[PDB]
């Protein structure tokens, strides 16, 4: 059920939800997938994460225009790395309102990323302050705590079985958490478990670098992270 559109892949996950996949080919390492979400919410589209590049992100907007033909009201990006925020200029050139964690926007210049137009803030329990995320419709934004990065956020789609862990969550078969160089190894396990507790009805876990998985992706990520403490 995948649709290819130039160098991009779209997979419908629900009546109103698609996963977008873009690829960066590294010589001698191969193509690396990064996944985000496209959500149809009545008469508008909401995007979660850019593609690796502006050109790839422009192609996402072209696919949306062709397959959904509704305006993109906003995009939320889940941390200040290239796979999630590489395409901010393409969103801005299209007049799309962009949202990120205030900390993502603060880190963005140091990470070589373009900051979102708007900053999200979070309660002590991890839930987004609603006034910083106006008209997010079914997007439920949760800051689980530091893990993959200090700024990583997650998004549940209300009225679906879908929760997006971004780069925080690894698939249930992963051999490791990958590169722990700039990770928060102390808090990673608790952040993974908080994401799980925030979206208890999510049975489909979408993540940046694997195919959609079961809640076993959350437990496996947390148990791998338990061995870092």
């Amino acid at each position: 059920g995948d649709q290819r559109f130039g160098d991009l892949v779209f997979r419908q996950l629900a009546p109103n939800v698609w996963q977008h996949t873009s690829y960066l080919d590294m010589p001698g390492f191969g193509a690396v997938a990064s996944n985000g979400l496209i959500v149809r919410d009545g008469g508008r589209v909401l995007v979660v994460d850019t593609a690796w590049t502006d050109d790839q992100t422009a192609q996402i907007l072209n696919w949306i225009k062709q397959e959904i033909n509704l305006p993109v009201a906003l995009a939320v990006v889940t941390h200040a790395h290239q796979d999630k925020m590489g395409g901010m200029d393409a969103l801005h050139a299209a007049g799309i309102a962009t949202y990120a964690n205030a900390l993502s926007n603060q880190l963005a210049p140091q990470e070589g990323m373009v900051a979102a137009q708007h900053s999200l803030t979070f309660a002590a329990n991890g839930w987004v302050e609603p006034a910083t995320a106006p008209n997010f419709g079914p997007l439920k934004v949760f800051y689980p705590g530091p893990g993959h990065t200090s700024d990583n956020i997650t998004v549940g789609i209300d009225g679906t079985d879908i929760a997006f862990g971004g780069c925080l969550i690894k698939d249930s078969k992963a051999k490791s958490l990958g590169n722990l160089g700039d990770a928060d190894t102390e808090h990673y396990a608790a952040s993974a478990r908080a994401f799980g507790a925030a979206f208890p009805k999510a049975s489909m876990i979408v993540m940046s670098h694997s195919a959609p998985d079961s809640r076993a992706a959350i437990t496996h990520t947390a148990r791998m992270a338990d061995k870092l403490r």
Binding site: V32, Q82, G178, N179, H209
Partner: peptide, 8 residues
Amino acid sequence: XXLXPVPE
């Protein structure tokens, strides 16, 4: 080069 899971 900060290419997500590739640290370069």
